Structure 1
Amino acid sequence: HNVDHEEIAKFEAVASRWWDLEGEFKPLHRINPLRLGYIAERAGGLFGKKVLDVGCGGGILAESMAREGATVTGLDMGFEPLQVAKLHALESGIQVDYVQETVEEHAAKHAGQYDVVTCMEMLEHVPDPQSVVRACAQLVKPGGDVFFSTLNRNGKFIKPAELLGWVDQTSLKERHITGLHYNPITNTFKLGPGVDVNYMLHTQNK
C-alpha cells in the first residue's frame, strides 16, 4: 500500500547497474564506508546484532553490515534490486536475508525484534514517509538504534527538520545528526556539522 510503483519501477530498471562502482550508484559506493562507520560507532558495534535495512535495494549497506557480523535482513519492494542483492551476497560469500515487502507489513509481523534499523535514501521515495518512520520505531527493540539518512542528492529532498517532527511522534529519541561535507585538507568526504543539503540521523528507542 505505502509504495510508489513508479519509484520502484525506476530502481527496478537500473538494478543491473547497482554494483558498478563507476555507474549510477557510484555515490552510494563511495559514501558507504562513512555511513557504515557512523552506524557502527553510534550503535556500539554491529557484531551479532539483528539489523533491518529498509529499502536495501541492491544491498550496498546491507551486505557491508553483514560483513561485520550482523544478522541482516534487507527489505525492499523492488523485485530486480533484490535479485541483484541476493546474487551479489552469494558472490561475496556473505549471508543476508532479503525479503520483498513493505516496512509496515514487516513491522506488524516483527515488532521489537531488531537491534538496529537503517533507513537510507529511502524516505523521499515513499508516498507516506511518516508511516515508515512509525514502522521503524515499531521494529526496533527497546534501546535499539534507528538511523535515517539522505547523503545522496541529484536532479525530492526531505528536510531534516521535517523528519524530526516525524521522529518526535514516536518512541524514538533523536541522539545525533551530522552532515556530509568535502574536506579540502584531507581531500575526502567527511561527516560533520551542517545539514543544509544532506544528513545522517541517529535515533534511539526509549
Structure 2
Amino acid sequence: HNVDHEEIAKFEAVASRWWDLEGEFKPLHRINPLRLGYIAERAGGLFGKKVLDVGCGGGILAESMAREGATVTGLDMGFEPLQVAKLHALESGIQVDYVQETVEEHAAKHAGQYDVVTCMEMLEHVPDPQSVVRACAQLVKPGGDVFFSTLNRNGVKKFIKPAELLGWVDQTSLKERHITGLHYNPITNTFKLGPGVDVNYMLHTQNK
C-alpha cells in the first residue's frame, strides 16, 4: 500500500540495463565501494550479520554485502529488478535472498531480526517515507545499525533534505550517530565521503 506504482513502473522499465557499468545506473556502480566501505566501517563489519537491503533493485549493494559474507535479504516492490538481481547473484555465485514485498509487511513479520538495515536512494520514491523509517527501526535488533542515503542526484527525483529525515528518525528508537556527504576531491581525482550534506548524504543510525 505504501507504494507509488508509477515509480515502480519506471524502474521495471529500465531493469535489464541495471548491471551495465556504462548505462543509466553507472553512478550507483561508481558509488558502491564508497557506501560499502562506510557501512562496513560504521557497523563494525558484515561477516555473519543478517542484513536487509530495502529497495534493493538490481542488487548492486546487496550482492556486494553478501560478497563480504553477510546473510543478505534484498527487498523490493519491482518485479523485473528482482528477476535481474536473482539472475545476477546466480551468475556471480553469490547467495542472496530476494523478496517482493513492502518494508511495512516485512517489518510486521520480521521485527528485530536484522543486524543491519540499509535504505539507499529509496525514500524519495515512497508516498510515506516516515512509515519506511518506522519500519526500518522495527526491523533492526537492539543495538543494530540502520543506514539511509541519497548519494545520487537527478533532474527527475525529489530530494529529501537531511534535516527532514532526522526528524523522522527522532520519532523512532533509532539514534543518529554520523552523517557524511559525497564530494569530488581534486587532489586525488576521486570521489570521497566527507563533510557537507547540502546536496547528498549518507546517515548512520543505531537502534537504542
Distance 1:87 1:169 in 2: 38
User: How far is the alpha carbon of 1:176 from its aligned partner?
Assistant: 0.1
Distance 1:31 1:124 in 2: 18
User: How far is the alpha carbon of 1:51 from its aligned partner?
Assistant: 0.1
Runs of 5+ consecutive residues of structure 1 not aligned to the other structure: none
Structure 2 residue matching 1:154: 3-state secondary structure: coil
Distance 1:204 1:38 in 2: 14
Q: Deviations over 1:138-169 (max 9, x none)?
A: 00000000000000001000000000000000
Distance 2:62 2:188 in 1: 28
Runs of 5+ consecutive residues of structure 2 not aligned to the other structure: none
User: How far is the alpha carbon of 1:192 from its aligned partner?
Assistant: 0.1
User: How far is the alpha carbon of 1:130 from its aligned partner?
Assistant: 0.1
Count of residue pairs brought into register by the alignment: 206
1:39 paired with 2:39, answer yes
User: How far is the alpha carbon of 1:42 from its aligned partner?
Assistant: 0.1
User: How far is the alpha carbon of 1:134 from its aligned partner?
Assistant: 0.1
Distance 1:39 1:204 in 2: 12
Correspondence list, 1:1-206, <5 A: 1-155=1-155, 156-206=158-208
User: How far is the alpha carbon of 1:76 from its aligned partner?
Assistant: 0.1
TM-score, L = length of structure 1: 1.00
Distance 2:161 2:92 in 1: 35
Structure 1 residue matching 2:175: 3-state secondary structure: strand
Percent identity for Structure 1 against Structure 2? 100
Q: Deviations over 1:80-129 (max 9, x none)?
A: 00000000000000000000000000000000000000000000000000
User: How far is the alpha carbon of 1:47 from its aligned partner?
Assistant: 0.1
Distance 2:196 2:152 in 1: 15
Q: Deviations over 1:182-201 (max 9, x none)?
A: 00000000000000000000
Distance 1:144 1:186 in 2: 34
Distance 1:200 1:186 in 2: 21
Distance 2:25 2:84 in 1: 13
User: How far is the alpha carbon of 1:9 from its aligned partner?
Assistant: 0.1
- Give 4+ residue runs of structure 1 displaced > 6 Å after superposition: none
TM-score, L = length of structure 2: 0.99
Q: What is the CA RMSD across the aligned residues, in angstroms?
A: 0.2
Distance 2:24 2:11 in 1: 11
Distance 2:51 2:188 in 1: 32
Structure 1 residue matching 2:182: 3-state secondary structure: strand
User: How far is the alpha carbon of 1:27 from its aligned partner?
Assistant: 0.1
